[PDB]
Design an enzyme around this catalytic site. Sequence first.
Site, PDB file in Angstrom:
ATOM      1  N   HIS A 128      -8.330  45.670 -75.016  1.00 57.02           N
ATOM      2  CA  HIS A 128      -9.265  46.821 -74.991  1.00 57.02           C
ATOM      3  C   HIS A 128     -10.724  46.360 -75.075  1.00 57.02           C
ATOM      4  O   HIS A 128     -11.574  46.961 -74.281  1.00 57.02           O
ATOM      5  CB  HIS A 128      -9.004  47.976 -75.978  1.00 57.02           C
ATOM      6  CG  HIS A 128      -8.551  47.647 -77.411  1.00 57.02           C
ATOM      7  ND1 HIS A 128      -9.303  47.911 -78.646  1.00 57.02           N
ATOM      8  CD2 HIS A 128      -7.275  47.313 -77.790  1.00 57.02           C
ATOM      9  CE1 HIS A 128      -8.501  47.623 -79.642  1.00 57.02           C
ATOM     10  NE2 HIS A 128      -7.323  47.215 -79.153  1.00 57.02           N
TER      11      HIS A 128
ATOM     12  N   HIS B 236     -16.916  44.689 -82.755  1.00 58.99           N
ATOM     13  CA  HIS B 236     -16.658  44.686 -81.361  1.00 58.99           C
ATOM     14  C   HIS B 236     -17.623  45.617 -80.674  1.00 58.99           C
ATOM     15  O   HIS B 236     -18.396  46.292 -81.354  1.00 58.99           O
ATOM     16  CB  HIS B 236     -15.244  45.178 -81.064  1.00 58.99           C
ATOM     17  CG  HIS B 236     -14.995  46.599 -81.647  1.00 58.99           C
ATOM     18  ND1 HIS B 236     -14.582  46.815 -82.927  1.00 58.99           N
ATOM     19  CD2 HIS B 236     -15.182  47.822 -81.104  1.00 58.99           C
ATOM     20  CE1 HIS B 236     -14.563  48.119 -83.191  1.00 58.99           C
ATOM     21  NE2 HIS B 236     -14.909  48.753 -82.059  1.00 58.99           N
TER      22      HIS B 236
ATOM     23  N   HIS C 106     -18.225  48.571 -77.197  1.00 59.21           N
ATOM     24  CA  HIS C 106     -17.798  49.385 -76.102  1.00 59.21           C
ATOM     25  C   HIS C 106     -18.891  49.378 -75.050  1.00 59.21           C
ATOM     26  O   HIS C 106     -20.064  49.429 -75.430  1.00 59.21           O
ATOM     27  CB  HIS C 106     -17.565  50.833 -76.620  1.00 59.21           C
ATOM     28  CG  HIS C 106     -16.618  50.923 -77.755  1.00 59.21           C
ATOM     29  ND1 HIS C 106     -15.294  51.129 -77.568  1.00 59.21           N
ATOM     30  CD2 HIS C 106     -16.795  50.757 -79.065  1.00 59.21           C
ATOM     31  CE1 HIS C 106     -14.674  51.175 -78.730  1.00 59.21           C
ATOM     32  NE2 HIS C 106     -15.559  50.923 -79.661  1.00 59.21           N
TER      33      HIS C 106
ATOM     34  N   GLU D  88     -20.281  55.291 -77.097  1.00 54.62           N
ATOM     35  CA  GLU D  88     -19.324  56.289 -77.552  1.00 54.62           C
ATOM     36  C   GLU D  88     -20.075  57.456 -78.190  1.00 54.62           C
ATOM     37  O   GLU D  88     -19.965  58.595 -77.708  1.00 54.62           O
ATOM     38  CB  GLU D  88     -18.340  55.608 -78.555  1.00 54.62           C
ATOM     39  CG  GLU D  88     -17.417  54.604 -77.820  1.00 54.62           C
ATOM     40  CD  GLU D  88     -16.101  54.295 -78.523  1.00 54.62           C
ATOM     41  OE1 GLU D  88     -16.173  54.109 -79.774  1.00 54.62           O
ATOM     42  OE2 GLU D  88     -15.117  54.322 -77.776  1.00 54.62           O
TER      43      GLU D  88
ATOM     44  N   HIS E 121     -19.813  48.185 -82.977  1.00 55.94           N
ATOM     45  CA  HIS E 121     -19.220  48.697 -84.155  1.00 55.94           C
ATOM     46  C   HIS E 121     -18.934  47.574 -85.124  1.00 55.94           C
ATOM     47  O   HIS E 121     -18.111  46.658 -84.754  1.00 55.94           O
ATOM     48  CB  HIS E 121     -17.899  49.394 -83.781  1.00 55.94           C
ATOM     49  CG  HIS E 121     -18.125  50.656 -83.040  1.00 55.94           C
ATOM     50  ND1 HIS E 121     -17.168  51.340 -82.267  1.00 55.94           N
ATOM     51  CD2 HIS E 121     -19.269  51.421 -82.972  1.00 55.94           C
ATOM     52  CE1 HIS E 121     -17.696  52.439 -81.825  1.00 55.94           C
ATOM     53  NE2 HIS E 121     -18.945  52.489 -82.182  1.00 55.94           N
TER      54      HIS E 121
ATOM     55  N   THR F  40     -12.152  55.118 -83.165  1.00 55.42           N
ATOM     56  CA  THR F  40     -12.242  55.607 -81.784  1.00 55.42           C
ATOM     57  C   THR F  40     -11.252  55.066 -80.848  1.00 55.42           C
ATOM     58  O   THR F  40     -11.305  55.380 -79.655  1.00 55.42           O
ATOM     59  CB  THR F  40     -13.685  55.386 -81.219  1.00 55.42           C
ATOM     60  OG1 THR F  40     -13.899  54.022 -80.989  1.00 55.42           O
ATOM     61  CG2 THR F  40     -14.746  56.056 -82.118  1.00 55.42           C
TER      62      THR F  40
HETATM   63 ZN    ZN Z   1     -15.298  50.716 -81.710  1.00 57.14          ZN
END
Ligand code: ZN
Length: 257
Positions: free
Chosen positions: A61, A91, A93, A103, A116, A195
């Site tokens: 992911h 990590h 996004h 996000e 995050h 999330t």
């Molecule tokens: Zn995250």
Amino acid sequence: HWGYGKHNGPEHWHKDFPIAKGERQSPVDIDTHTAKYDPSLKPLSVSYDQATSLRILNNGHAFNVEFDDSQDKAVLKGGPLDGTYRLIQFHFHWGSLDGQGSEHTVDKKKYAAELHLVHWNTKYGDFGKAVQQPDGLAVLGIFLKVGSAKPGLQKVVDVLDSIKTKGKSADFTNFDPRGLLPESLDYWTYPGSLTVPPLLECVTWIVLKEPISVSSEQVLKFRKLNFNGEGEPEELMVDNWRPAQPLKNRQIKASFK
Ligand SMILES: [Zn+2]
């Protein structure tokens, strides 16, 4: 399995994880004209001088930078929090293009990416126990825009070649996450969730106002990662963000006027 596509993306997650339609899901849109300034909120205390990064992992992911969380080393405290929260991993996004990737959103604005930093409440003893509690995690969220390079991120970008595909990891020691922080620690806060599946409703979110700048070259190297494993059909690791979820019965509070 779950992921970010037509067939298994966020809009499907509720079938395996019905808490996806729960009361305190993340991320959300931050409406800066309704968030209330709360003078009772304290400054955030970010104590990362003894942080011990161990390893970077392509989990299929995102990629996770993991820390040794066996002692009180890297801790988040203050802010909206009661007690002490230990850094376990960070990590990101990000998007396929610079106009999306975050996000959380700010007045519906999407940033190119979002960082995050995930911390668990030491009163619950380990991460697996903490995620079962409504106050178990504190996630520090930091927006990325594209412009000047972030020197502090370059060690991360230059190891990505070695963890291209799902399941790959690499030694990643002595990385200093202070190099990823903006100048200001002004923040918004609200109660929410992880999330990604299992989407547990265990997070105090702390979203910094001030984005960091990264270069187009830096984010381009994020977009060369792969969601697939070695030797499988190449699907580039892009657009690994969950969109904003309904705010429901929640208040977003600002630390700043
Ligand atoms: Zn995250």
